[model samples]
Target chain A: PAVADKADNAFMMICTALVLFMTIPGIALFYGGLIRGKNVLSMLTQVTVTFALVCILWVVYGYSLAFGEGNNFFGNINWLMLKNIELTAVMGSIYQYIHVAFQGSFACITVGLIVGALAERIRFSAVLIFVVVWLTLSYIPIAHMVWGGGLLASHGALDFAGGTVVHINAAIAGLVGAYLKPHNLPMVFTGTAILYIGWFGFNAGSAGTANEIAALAFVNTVVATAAAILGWIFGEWALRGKPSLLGACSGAIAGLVGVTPACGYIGVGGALIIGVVAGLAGLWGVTMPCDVFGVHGVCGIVGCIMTGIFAASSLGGVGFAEGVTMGHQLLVQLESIAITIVWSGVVAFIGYKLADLTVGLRVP
Target chain B: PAVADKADNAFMMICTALVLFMTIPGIALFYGGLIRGKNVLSMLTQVTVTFALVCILWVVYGYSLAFGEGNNFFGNINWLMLKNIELTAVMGSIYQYIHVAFQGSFACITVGLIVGALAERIRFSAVLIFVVVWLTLSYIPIAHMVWGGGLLASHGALDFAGGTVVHINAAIAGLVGAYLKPHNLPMVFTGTAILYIGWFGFNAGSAGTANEIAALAFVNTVVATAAAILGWIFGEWALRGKPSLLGACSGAIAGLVGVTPACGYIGVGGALIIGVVAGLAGLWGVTMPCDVFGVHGVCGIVGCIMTGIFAASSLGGVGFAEGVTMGHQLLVQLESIAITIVWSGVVAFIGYKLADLTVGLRVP
Candidate 1:
């Protein structure tokens, strides 16, 4: 007996747009500014075209397989092209179409993150082939488990916004696939700023309603991003004696990734602690044009593990579900992480190979 | 009787952030990429500093003076620093704090629109002086008259968002104040994309609730912007034999400006018409750098007048207020437009003079 809440519908639509914003100019500009000048146009073209591809693919079959009710590994094809879904049908507090759009946005950004790692390295045709393969396999299955009520949800995993499904999943795929100093620092800063702003949607919108949970997610996003900025700056100062804008931008992304899994589950204090820790870890991980494996992968893992500890009511989080202890939750989190890493790595390998066979992976 | 809706509260907060996003890197980057290379840092610094200044000013006195109940022109100073506002106070369906933040964002963007016109022409110190004077005298009063239940609202003038307060108001101030072909086309595209994404907040958020009205606004914004993009490109192609990226971006802004006042009141058809007209008019008006007067000013006027026509129920709009006819509504729209031009222009003149006297207007 759910009904569409006008407020929730409005919130989701805006949030969906914001998430898309992160990919187009957000990821594109972030990576574009970091790459060689000669490749900026190509990078932009790749991200743009791939984004459109994912969107089309998502509507055609991705949504059906990822979110349609199914087993642990795959979903039914009932929603292919979103057929058979009533226009006015409600999902939670909003329309079903909104849910589809919101989830599709996540899929889009995941593919976008992969583009950052594969940029300038892979041929355009190869990238498209890889996207078609990896998204169908790696992205869809993980999303099903964590967000679509599959194995992870049944096991009581606490990925509020996609620590495993998005950040870690994309990061590992990126690692399986693929710097130069930023060519344009200002462009990098602009991209970083856009990403931070758009992320309010990514994190808070994941709450799926405009409620206290959404508020908690919003506040956590702000504080964690701020704390991470300071933490990374301090770390940079300690290590190199001077903090740079690039460092600050990277810190912001790190904090964003860290809080993605716990934004709705944790309190302000937990957010701060997670932000500072993730910032330092991210600095250490920056071993990066886009730093896909470094900041996103490392901070995402840190955030997921911390969510188990912080979600304990004693630590100012929303608290664990009934009968779930911290130790049990932590083990569950680790298992989810391990599963995502292995799943994404294997799928990405297959995707790369398939692309190579089809069109060749690298440019001549 | 008003109860705070969590859905509405969440929507407003995110909307507020989105509007702010339009200014910082949004407007800044837009103007920055269009300006001379040497002044990019200065322009960014000016925008960043002024934005911070406006936020502080809005909290301290701007909110009270503009929003507190008052006479036909100005409001009371009862809410200075929001001193008397309760923690849980509700405004309409959202918290009063949310309203405060939302209104404050409109003010920030108004000033931001002015910066695009004044970027390279004015000295930093002069710009600050002008902003303080103009914001206090011009921006605050117009906002009061329109949104704060003063002269314009009393006359039953319809301004869904801020056609008068934001677009025409800032457009005139910019006209009184002050481009270079864009130095960077790609950067311009990035900025244009950001503004378009952020504007969903600007237009739809103006509905102040997540209802059918908000939905109308959202749909209209999409169609209008898209229509305008096509419109401007067609006009450019017809005139110059080719359309440029810069032209497309300008067209988008044109459509956004045209729909500002009519989005909530008009249907999709009206929105499409307004967008095309505004886009073509904007192309003609582009008689350079930012074209603040050309796009914002001209299209804003175009939008305001069109709202009078499009808001009638017979034309698929939400309909006019009681006893209001098309002819009367058009006159009222024109009156509002005239008032905004005179008010913003005179205040801008005073601001410029004050800035000239204080620190000299020119950068030299």
Candidate 2:
């Protein structure tokens, strides 16, 4: 148990670093490699600026609104700038301050994803305005609803991690922005690689300890990612007659997204199955007019639903919370998924409109 | 104390990941970007193969020889391939197995530095033979002496991390190998960038916790790296008339190298001083024959010596162990540094000769 305590802190810090890595070099390189050499500087500039902006916003009010106690919707702003919280205050076991910083990093990377790609086609000022809007209205509410004991948590839904909050939410925003201005394909691939590397933090870090769960999640992350890569490559080979680096990387990301919700709650077998399915779905997702719908949206739903099955104590999952039945949990998970899709989609439309009115959403 | 437990594990796991990151994409990209398009593949191949080989070797025997308890010279092989170790053995409060994997990663990236650059000039078979010989003879033994309760630790020398084991060890090996390489400045720059990013993990992870110490180390890493950048830039600007990207990148690596041994032991102020000196030392280090001697050799020594002064409790270091005054500690530090230089130099020379006799050290 003493070692368990050490393992938990170790797991959390490493995970936090991984999350930060996703934005800095991981996503930065991914997008850097993807963009036409001409646009690399501009894209990098956007990622850098947006990342800073998100960090500031998360500290100022994002954490308060999303994680602070409130009603069935968003939380209150009692802890603005992480106010009124002692450095020694415990959230679970780690310092509350550490948790705040850790979660803030996640929000920053998610925003970085949208802003990095969209800045090329959207005006710089406009993208900033849009990120502020989307992060506040869309990101915070969904995060609260699932993670902060909001409506979904009350309904017995088992996200375990941020399948609904992080991946699906970001994917939706990305889709809306991509539709506004189609992304360069190579840029997408580069982003995928960083995202893949960053995701180990996202998934394994969820264990909050470097114990059996962290070990399990770590191995699952590796296996699922590898499986997804193969899955995507095979799919591409079947469809396009050969596997491209881009396809393989995208599949890797898709597997990461799908397994995010389940990584902590499932076994290796569950991870591989989820990974392959996610990979296939990812291939289908990326090939479509809006890949987010296919990759994040579809795979997020798959992961959430599959968690209901795989999380059963007998099925190699972490086992369900007390008093939760498989059938009932499945329904709750579906409801959470459905609500997120509709809520994010609607707010995304509004965000897009506001961005357009404020700064003209597309490049001239 | 409870918080310390978690923090230590966090530090270790995250550090492990950072070291791993340095090898895969960090060193890989550094070498990849710097090499000619024709040679990039070979360099990458070299880094990859050596990385895999190191992973296997470290698990099989490297960890045991370096870390297993023995006399001041070297550790025993009681834990070879982790035999007689439980899946959940605690080494410093985290699972012993996790420590094995994490420490093994450091060994991998260190070898990666030499193989990545030198692979281009040396024969594929020759490089493989050299890595096995050098890693076994030079790397494992030095690691034992410094990290594994070897001569340095027994003498109260402070290397909170691996300045001697990693930077100095790799630098000397790199220099020996560079003599066999055709000069490629750009490739060196790229390798430097990757090394810089991966080092965050290396330095901060050494704290083995996500608490104040990890935070301090993280800040120190940035401050030192930036200071070194400025220091190198100023020197480069003065020397070359204009600071080139290559020079800036190299300065960053030099600062990173100098700070490696000192980052966890020193404070921000100490870090700043170390950075400026290391940067100057690095610039000086690189300009001579092969830059490794200048950068790694000079900076590594500087970092080790400085750790003696800065690690004083008065200066906000973790403080020296019992019966060790600053003067005595400095002497001990010097002795360790001298030993490493001579030990590594002699071993490197022998390694080159052995390699020459077996497979030829130089290209035709």
Candidate 3:
């Protein structure tokens, strides 16, 4: 049984590495090639600094408050800085510490999204303060509510890999942040490709094993992403009458986000549907006058909602939890979505205001 | 035990993905950024085509001949196209089939080395023919000899990753190819970065687990690479008066290749030594009249011989086989080195000659 657990440990650790890569080089390079040449160094510096910042913050109290035993809103701080934990402590068949690190990686990438966009205009120190404040108040609570045994999980809201918590949540923050300074689109495309590659870990690794479930997730990731690419290309071909590299890349990301919540729970057929819809939504999301609002906000919401519809036991979900129906789950999913939107939107407004007051938002 | 094995499988799969990324976008962008803008797309297309070709070739017969259970020369082709294999078959705690895919990635990058260099000069179709010939005759047999229980492995010549088989082997081939057409230096840097990032999987993933061994390899990778950067910079400053971006990136790659063979078998201290030497050797390797020959060929050989010195039993290596001393193992390592050099040189000559006669090797 311990041997079995080691196998799980291996999967989780490797998956953690993949997720980390999404930020370090993946997102960095993606953003690097997108921005005007002068700002490339500044953007890269921001991503790198934010990545380090997130790592430290996640370990300090983020993990404890999000994952520790707690009420419906947020968990307690029992594991702050991973205190009082043995090297070999087990959680869900693998080492508990590894879970902390793995989950922390997710948080870091989410923060990376916000930081990458805001690097150009906002003061660096101001953005740092905002990340600390926002991550603690907004991200921690949402992560707890959805991933921890907090409100969303308690209500049986389906978020296998953070559709509402990570994608939607980050998108909102990004939207608010984008209002301060928009990212260069080409940079977004580069980041999107790296995100797609690193995402194999993000989606499939969530299974926490290399079994049939992982294989299913793996294939689904590919199918949805490919389908999304085609779907978005179709949209571009239709609306813009020309396909662009940026559209294809954005569609790929939308497909990935859409598929995240459903990856472990859905079959291949379900994935294809999710991917196509997500792709179209992603295209629409990015093409709007305000792109972050369009892409992340809309795509995040679409993915969260679609998860509820497609995650029925009959359709290959992990099966309904006790006393939960498909309808009940759908209701719960909507509640979670509403909660994330308001929470992210409100906190984002505050974060922006705080940054604006502390140091003017726009570049000198 | 099965569960533990599954962990190994998951780790390997994710690791393989990282390696694949090296060629696709990692190396692609690295090369893309370095080349004059016009040649970027052509180089990228060449890499893409060769990458696909290598994948197909590896599955068809490369895996079988390189890794199947055969004699002390090469594995049998019983597993050609993975015939008669169960999807669930296990090898050293992972599915045997997956191991094939993982190892196949190594072959693809190896081919990428040559293709990336020759892209600007060779006719696309002619390059394809050259790869088919070189891969089958040179790359496959060498992989067999080193990793597939061939002569090198039997002689206990340690190459935990592939300092010799991949870097050295490909370097030789690259040298022969470059003689026909030299690459833009900036393009070389781009390829260097991709190769560096991808090498994480190449070296650490070779541990086949995500435990201390992988950790050691990971740290070694970063340290050695950084150290090599400094070393190369120092050398460049002393000799050339200023370190170019190309030199810094190249130094980083030189350190990476030098440590590849020794990563899993040595310590942090050992990694530092390997990095410095490799960096210097790589500088020298690159400075040679024929650049590819100098860098890949020379540095690869440096890494191979150093692995022999560093992987001694007293120095924390998994000890050599019965009655083999450091001196004896060093001799054996030299033998393997000599064999690879001669083998690659001769075969490369034939490969180039064939390409010249058939397709006209040089570009118009």
Candidate 4:
């Protein structure tokens, strides 16, 4: 059963590429477009350099510490440089290499997300230093706890596809720096479109197999995104007397984040509600130029909390874990959210402080 | 066996989205960046409108006319609006609906490619009119002949993906306009990166199953693209004394086109040679602002011909069909290329004329 399935292998490989696409050109252009013209090239450079930096770091130690088997907080260093793994090793139904790459893409995008807050404000040296420390301390531990059979898995915490590990985690880091007029609106639109399309891989690929659960996640993503767009525009039109392209794109992203944790477990009906709610909720949370803290942070928390509610069989979702009541699941969900918020917030602070102490923070 | 495999279904669905992404923001932004800023919005508008047009047409009749059972040049109208296809019907290993979407994506991108040439030059209404006519008269017939068990497929033409139906066909249509400072170099670079990422789906998805063939295509895409970039930059550096970013991006695209028809059938060694050759060859073929005809047209011809040679077992390809000799396969490839060239050229002439007679051609 653990042997590689070509179908799953192919799906995961393509999914891995899709997720990487979201970081490289997707988030890069999205952030680049939102910046003033003077900083566009700088923004692209920072993203590209940091992207390469993260890849090298992930290969060196990030994957080993985040994904290798170990205790609650982190994995052992036995898999350093992917040493102990055979080329033929299977992870679930696909080759372990594909799993490594897939998980590595998540790390890349999570780190990419953080730069949206620091761009144009932080020095490149400080950004790199901060990324190195935050990634090792924060992202690695959170990922290990959730997906590497560590603390959260042991406690039956439901993240589905990185509501905690990706969106919330990156949102917290970005929020710590906490933040603009977009110079190129078309680029922003294009970036938003790429992220929307790439998210299919992010959510469905979390199923780790191209099974019914993956299909459920895929359909939910479409439903939620569409609903969110409508919800955001309606709110905008009512409040501001005009709906904007930026607002629409923001709504779409918020919906995507809102459904990230719940996509695999929820039915279309649940997805629609979550999307619309997050869409409107995100309207009130626009506190950054990139909306890192707004859409991702706010919707991420909302989605994780609601997953506990909608995941009940009565709510047209996958049922709660064995012997776990809805109340218990809801409480656990809140506990996990609090833990991620505190953990990521604290680590981000330390990383930034270390960078400040060394190379200084701002470009000036 | 008729039941859809979830893995295959998911794989194809994602691949379909990838191909669609290549068109919408992919080619739209690519062409938009290459045009003057005054016409950037015009380019974007045309691509987006045509994208919607193609999608609607694909559902209404395009899929049936190209894929339904009929003559060598056309499919029957029985599946118009997909009337007879059941939700449960499977195409190969996936649902028939997935097959429809996958094939429809090809049609959309092919049309999207043509607009890259006509943008900023043609009138908006004229562009729409030309697309409707050219799509029906040119694209559908070529697609039917090559893929729908028609004249070329019946004659054993070897197009693993769509060197003929897509690249060559669209290249010829674009050439009929006889064709710009790129306003945004970074946008061009961003678009190039996207097309590279999305092309994995175009080549691998052509396998119709997540099998060894798909894996080969995926790997070939990566290898060929990397090799092509080096080849193009080397040529640029040697000749111009400086390898420009634009040259590198063009070389990557040229390599992508060069490998498209050969990806599933050729070995990695064959992919490497085809890529480097196409990259150097395309350096001499840069005759357009967007290089639609230059890269796609020239490299497509090169790829189709080389596919005949490289597909030989001695050259590390899948070898010729059954007892067919290399010389015979080469002749068939040339014949198919000739037919497509003439067919698309004449049809494109008529399409432009129709647009001119009705709404005039240029934007005025």
Candidate 5:
């Protein structure tokens, strides 16, 4: 059989674009609408410019350093400038170039998630400096650890899509940052709608093929997001006496974040559960003053932890790896989550410090 | 051999999502931003609810009627409710379910294009009534005739992805629906950016696989779109006093719409030529009161017609189906274009009249 299936190649290409769409305009609009008018243009500028920068980096060393075959901490730089990797080289079932594009997109969104949260608070020069340092130092290593046959994957981390690598990782930076007051509610909802649709690619594409697993992830993505919307709306109604559009959008994102790790591994029933829980958690967490981190960080941690439980065959998941018990898998999941949190937090701290030292973190 | 190829499955699934995103928030935001504020909420609501209605319709009988084997006018309803179709059934080497979703998404966006354009001037109940009638009467039959192996397809009308069925069809409805002015340029640009990104799926996914053709379409889409943006901007700048955001966005969409029918069939060179022409046509057309129709209709017709010219080996296209003369293909393309215009216009007129009689077409 050919390593590159036309179907898989087609799927991954679109999926890569979808994931990239999530950051380029998806998160940008979502976050842009939420920020005050005083900094809205600046925020958009930050996102657009940073997005351009990230793309350039991804094509340079980012792809090579994060994805190349290496030991525990990082991959080798053998594919620098994507020189050694053949455009026709197969990764899983798709071309290596497609994999490079797809993984690079993930890196873009992770940075977008954090930047959007901190954009209103951070200075342009400071943020740019922080992103360059953080992306090279923090994101590359963590991505290598979980997905690039790194320490976490070696330890049997079950991050179906990017619950640990993306949601939690971005959330950690957001948590450490300062942030929001929504300026335009409808605009925010529009961005939410984009993210929700684009996320199908994010989850299902992670299956690396367009097989039953991808179908499972696709349906799960839809089911979970819908469930989360309902969960968040009603939860808000139950707790706050009203359900706003913002609540609904938050719920959608929360469910998306929660189901990221579980969409491929769990059944539709499990997806619904995770979504509702994450939605409710998000609804509650948004009570915090820091709007960005509140919903993302809290819901993300909850989703990652719950993936440990729901990924068991007993709970309608795809089941643990060979010889791995539910208890053992749970322990592994917890350990990975713990490491991601600390890793992200410590790195974020340093990133901000470096930014503050270089360009002054706050805007005049 | 298994009907499902993981690669194709993955590709179509993401493609389906990308196409769906075109309608969900893409077109909604684009048109919503153009309308005045008092009507913006109504516009978004119309786009969202009608999107749901289209989804429901697709599953009910739209899929079967538009797709299941039949004669020149319509497909049989043998697959109503998608009954008797095996989950693993293959259509073009991917699962039947994915085909269903992908086709359904096209229906949604076609409807979205129509709905968003007229939502402001039309009444809620009226729009819904029109959508049902037009979708069944006009859209479904056109889709059937062209893609469901009906009237046009039998004659070898080469529409790679909905130049006739989608762009021109909606453009006609919008033209007759009466027209407008834009309120926010930035939001419109955001929507344009989104549509541009999602258009990749629209074009390449039409290839039905991740083969050389899809790759060609992918790169062409990028090239054509970029070219159209430049072509439109310079044309606008040359004729008009200044190059504006609206012009840039319009140029982007013009390029996209123009390249639709040609992307898969034409090589990069053909795509670029078609794109430039479409953008120039679009720039001229938008001077009309009904901008959507002016741009989409003119550009769609130009693209569809040009596909005949461009798809020839001499012109760097994949080359017209073996032995089909370029002149013959040109006549077929023109016939398809003319048929679509007449069919869509008559049906749209009736649909609007039906709406006027039943629900009163205009908002109070």
Candidate 6:
């Protein structure tokens, strides 16, 4: 007798759309504005087509391999094509299909964040081929391990939204696959605005239910992002002699990514600390091309480890799982981050190699 | 006792954020691209400043006037500044605060859609003045009449979302104000994409609960928007030489506007019909400088009327209330549309005149 709560179902549906929006025009616009005008259309086309490609794949098998119960490294094919699953079947107190779509949207955005930065340099065929392999090997197994009762989950790693599964995972791959640069500051600002707003869905929706936890996450998201914007400007004003809109936008993304893992677990005060640290880190970090790795990779790592400290009851968190000491949790968090980086880096190499072999990597 | 459901509360919160995104960077970028580079900054500033203005106004008195329970033409001011509302108060199964934010978002986007198109030509101060007047006089009273249980709702007007209140209302205002044009088509396309995506919240969230009605609206929104895209592209290809990305984006908006008032009432098939009609109508519609009135004004009327017809058991919709015939419902819808057009037109004229009297209406 599985019963679905309409409220949860509704929240997840809108949440899924918000995440999808992050990639469609969110990342596309963010990356599009930074590229040279001559190659803008080419980059946008690749993103749009690949986005469609990922959507189709998710429905076919992505959800199954990443979400279906199996082993630490993989999920079973029981949900292949969503087979034998009732539309009314509940997942996380909501409809199973909604979970399927929500999770699928995360995959799409992760891929988009990585590919969109390098699409101009990479050949269309190569990028498409790379997406297929990377999505299969890196994205699925890691998503399974971290979220689908896989190895990391068994080891008790905490990633409230996707600091590891999304940000670091994609950022490391972005760096390893090869590099990035930007142009329109205003367009960049617009993209940043969209991403900042869309992040409410990314962070709060991670609660998997609409409750006090979601509320906490929502507030933390807003506060941290605001702090990050200011943090970025201050750092820029000190380091570069003047604060610029680009810095403001960059800071916003920094705070957003930094707060991703901790939003649901920490208090608002904790959110501000992580935000400032991430923004400063972004400003100080060395970036090549578009800074996907600089901001996302670095900020993601900082947030994930901090989650262990902030989730303690003394720190105004929900208090981590019973018997899990902050010291042990911090170690586990570092170990999880290590696994994600190595796994993504190695797989990204393979994916790029595959793309290079199939159709040549660089655009002809 | 009124109770809050965490899931619904969470849904509406994120839905509000999504709707806000439509205006913040969404409309800003869309308008940014079409304007000449020289005036781009001014346009963006106008949008940002005016957006902030609208947000402030909604909090002060707009929500109370539009949503507070009162007589047929207006709501009382008891809820001004949310004076007596408890944070825990529930409305339609969600917290009252969520409703406030969600409803306020509609007001912001309406102003964004109108101001965004003509920010460069219109005086900044004038835009602010117009937003204040138009929102108060036209938007509030009509919202009260249609949704706040005013004359229209009492007569059983079937508006699933805000076809009459938002789209047509804003479009008429745009037409009455003056003409406008676009400078960057790609930017426009991106804005349209964001709007189309955010519209899931704007349309489905109107259900106020994650029930079957929301689900139906969700499905209907997707099908209609997609159909409209194809319809617009096909129409463009037939009328012009080649189908352009701008056309695709415009078509998406047309479908979105067309389905706004019908998504909750009509079946998927009905959505498809409405979408195609709206898209084709947009393609063949007349244009001012920015095409605001051409698409939004025309498509909204089309959707509002179609909602009346499709909301019947025979058409696979939820069906009208007891003893309410489709013809009667259609009559109510048409009357609502007529009143809104006249109201908006009169108000927009006054708003422009006020702006003209003060800031002279155009930038020097």
By TM-score, the better pick of 1 and 5 is 5
* Tens-place lDDT digits, model 6, residues B1-364: 9898777777788678878988988888877877777888887888888888888988998898898978999998898899999888889899988999999999889988898877867877888899999999999999999889999999999888899989999999998877424667667768777786878889878988776577667756766776777677678768785456567677778888999999998866687788889889888884324586688989999999999998887876778999988889888999999999999999999998888988888777
For each candidate in turn, the interface RMSD (Å) is 5.0, 5.6, 5.3, 5.2, 4.0, 4.1
Considering lDDT, which of the candidate structures 1 and 5 is the better prediction for this target?
1
Residues A200-243, candidate 4: write the lDDT tens digits. Answer: 88998998887667766765676677567767867887889755
> What DockQ would you assign to candidate 3?
0.14
lDDT of 6 by residue, A1-364 (tens): 6677776787678777878778768887887778887766666656655665575567568889999978889998786555655545677777776677688778888988987888878877788888998898999999999999999999988898899999899998899866414677677776777787678878877888878998999999998888888888999999789998888888898899999989998988898888898888887774324576789988899899889888888988878888899999999999999999999988889999988888898877
Off by over 4 Å in 6: A1-34, A37-90, A93-105, A123-145, A150-158, A172-201, A210-291, A294-364, B1-29, B36-108, B115-158, B172-201, B209-252, B262-290, B297-364
Candidate with better lDDT, 1 vs 4: 1
lDDT of 5 by residue, B167-264 (tens): 89989877777731688778788788878877888898898887888899899899888888888999989998679898889888998999998888
Query: Residue by residue across A1-364, what tens digits does model 1's lDDT show?
Result: 7889898898889889889988978888888778888888888889899999999998999998998989988898998899988999898999999999999999988888888657788889999998999999999999999988899988999999999999999998888787115688777778777787789889989989876677667756766776787678679879997556577778778889999999999866688789889889999999534476779999999999999999888887889999999999999999999999999989999999988898898887
All candidates in order of DockQ, best leading: 5, 6, 3, 1, 4, 2
Best by TM-score: 5
lDDT of 1 by residue, B1-364 (tens): 6688977787787877778788857888888778888777666656655664576567668888999988888898888756576545678888776677688878888898787557677887788898899899998999999999999999989999999999999988887786115687787787788788779989988988878898999999999999999999999999999998888899999999999999999989999999999999999899544476778999999999999999999899999998999999999999999999999988999999988888999988
The docking category that best describes candidate 3 is incorrect
In angstroms, the error of model 2 at A2 is 19
* DockQ value of candidate 1: 0.13
Give the lowest summed-lDDT range of ten residues in model 1 chain B.
B44-53
Q: What residue runs in model 2 are displaced by over 4 Å at the alpha carbon?
A: A1-21, A24-29, A37-61, A77-90, A94-98, A123-129, A179-252, A267-317, A323-334, A354-360, B1-4, B38-89, B107-187, B193-364
Q: Relative to the unseen true structure, what is the C-alpha lDDT of residue B144 in candidate 2, on a scale of 0 to 100?
A: 86
- DockQ for model 6 equals 0.18
Model 4 spans with C-alpha error above 4 angstroms: A226-245, A268-273, A287-290, A309-319, A323-328, B1-14, B34-91, B95-207, B210-364
lDDT of 5 by residue, A78-98 (tens): 888999887778888788899
Per-residue accuracy of model 3 over B1-364 as CA lDDT, tens digit each:
3532676677777777778777766666565565555665566656655665576566567788888888776677787655644445667666765576568778877887777666777876678788888888888888889988888887788887887788788888877676552245654565576678778888999887777888888998998898889999999998899998878987887888888888887777778888888888888766652354466677677877877877766776645678888889789878988888788888888888888898787766
Please give, for residues A1-364, the per-residue lDDT of candidate 2 as tens digits.
Answer: 1112445554666578778978986777666666566777887898898898998998999999989989877999898988987756767656666677778888887787666656557788888888888899988998889888899888877876688887778878878777663234433443554565577677767765556566556646655665676677679879997556467566767777888888877765677778788888888866772444467677888888888888887776778888888888888888888888788777877888897987787776
TM-score, every prediction: 0.64, 0.63, 0.63, 0.64, 0.67, 0.66
